[PDB]
Ligand binder design. Structure first.
Ligand SMILES: Nc1nc2c(ncn2[C@@H]2O[C@H](COP(=O)(O)OP(=O)(O)O)[C@@H](O)[C@H]2O)c(=O)[nH]1
Length: 169
């Protein structure tokens, strides 16, 4: 439907979600993507908390408008952690995710049909993940030792992708 309901499993392609709290309101906005093209996109506004999964990787997501606030992941198979992080970055509509679009991206297919902007961004980044990580930035990992940082190669690290933390497991 239109909005993800508390406790309801939902899909955004490869990302699975399930609301813990909050409400979003969606408004259309002209967004500048890093391409230099300006595209009309449905921007959610409000604080939202979700359970998320990509394959075997689980976590909890907090967002606000156009910002991934916090993402706590449970340790898992590396490919899945990497995609869960990408899918969370796109799902949150973070200003930095928009900036990382470098190459051409289509919002219309060759038959001239209408494609989903958020879906097409997910497709662009699952395939060119670098292009998001370039924009993302690092911060000091959490002081506690039940919590670790992770870098874009998915190894534990003393500096971590901003807002991202890992628990074992
Ligand atoms: N933050 C947030 N995003 C949602 C919610 N419900 C759906 N979405 C996402 O909002 C986007 C909807 O975009 P799309 O399906 O292309 O529909 P459009 O916005 O009507 O053009 C998708 O990426 C969904 O995963 C919600 O409750 N909160």
């Amino acid at each position: 439907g239109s909005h993800m309901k508390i406790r309801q499993r939902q899909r955004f392609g490869r990302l699975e979600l399930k609301r813990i709290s909050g409400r979003g309101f969606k408004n259309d906005e002209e967004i500048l993507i890093g391409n230099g093209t300006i595209q009309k996109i449905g921007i959610w506004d409000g604080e939202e908390e979700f359970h998320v999964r990509c394959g075997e990787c689980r976590g909890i997501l907090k967002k606000s408008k156009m910002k991934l606030e916090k993402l706590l992941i449970n340790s898992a198979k590396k490919e899945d952690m990497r995609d869960l992080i990408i899918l969370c970055m796109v799902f949150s509509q973070d200003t930095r995710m928009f900036q990382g679009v470098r190459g051409e991206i289509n919002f219309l297919n060759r038959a001239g049909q209408l494609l989903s902007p958020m879906y097409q961004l997910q497709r662009y980044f699952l395939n060119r993940s670098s292009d998001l990580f370039d924009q993302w930035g690092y911060e000091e990992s959490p002081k506690a030792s039940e919590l670790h940082g992770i870098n874009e190669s998915m190894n534990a690290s003393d500096y971590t992708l901003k807002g991202v933390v890992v628990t074992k497991n």
